[PDB]
Design a protein around this nucleic acid. Structure first.
Lengths: 113, 113
RNA sequence: AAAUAA
């Protein structure tokens, strides 16, 4: 499209549950009351959501919401992931995404305490 | 205080470490993902935290924090225990603490795994 | 069995 027309970007970032079994990443990404994710979107000027299987603190509600069929719950069949999104001019859109994907690496490795 | 004004209650509940040596009660109480403790508050309408010496899984981390001197770690000198807390009008609060105190006894017995 | 939930 047009180089100065604002654009919407989106990239699904897989959360490594197969490589780090049993570690609660969702708690780690959000931190206390979500201020580790609030702060991480503010830092990079993107918007981030944790979607997919297990993104919700229960198998059951997340299973029902999933069996409902509504498009808003399409993500709960996909693997657990963070969806980073940005709306800005193209040069800015890709640059912040690139920025955002560098600062998120640390939340996708365990704490070892 | 006043009969329908809300009050705070707290009651330490001791964990029998002398009686079942080396049994991990902390894991039993929190279960997976911390949700057997979390469900036990929802059922009883209380709030619960595990404090005292041995509440943390790293004995040297816990002794740093204990030395550190901050009031938030004062509990790491007391015996290992669950501190049940409630904020409600007196009638409800005492009824919930009691409910919680019967419903907590199951978790103060080891599993023989 | 280890408590962060936007």
């Amino acid at each position: 499209g047009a180089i100065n027309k604002n654009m919407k970007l989106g990239q699904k970032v897989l959360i490594p549950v197969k490589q780090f079994p049993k570690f609660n990443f969702v708690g780690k990404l959000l931190g206390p009351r979500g201020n580790s994710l609030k702060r991480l979107q503010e830092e990079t000027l993107t918007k981030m959501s944790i979607l997919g299987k297990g993104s919700m603190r229960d198998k059951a509600k997340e299973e029902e919401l999933r069996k409902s069929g509504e498009a808003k719950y399409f993500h709960l069949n996909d693997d657990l992931h963070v969806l980073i999104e940005v709306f800005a001019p193209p040069a800015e859109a890709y640059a912040r995404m690139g920025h955002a994907l560098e600062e998120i690496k640390k939340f996708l490795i365990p704490d070892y305490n």
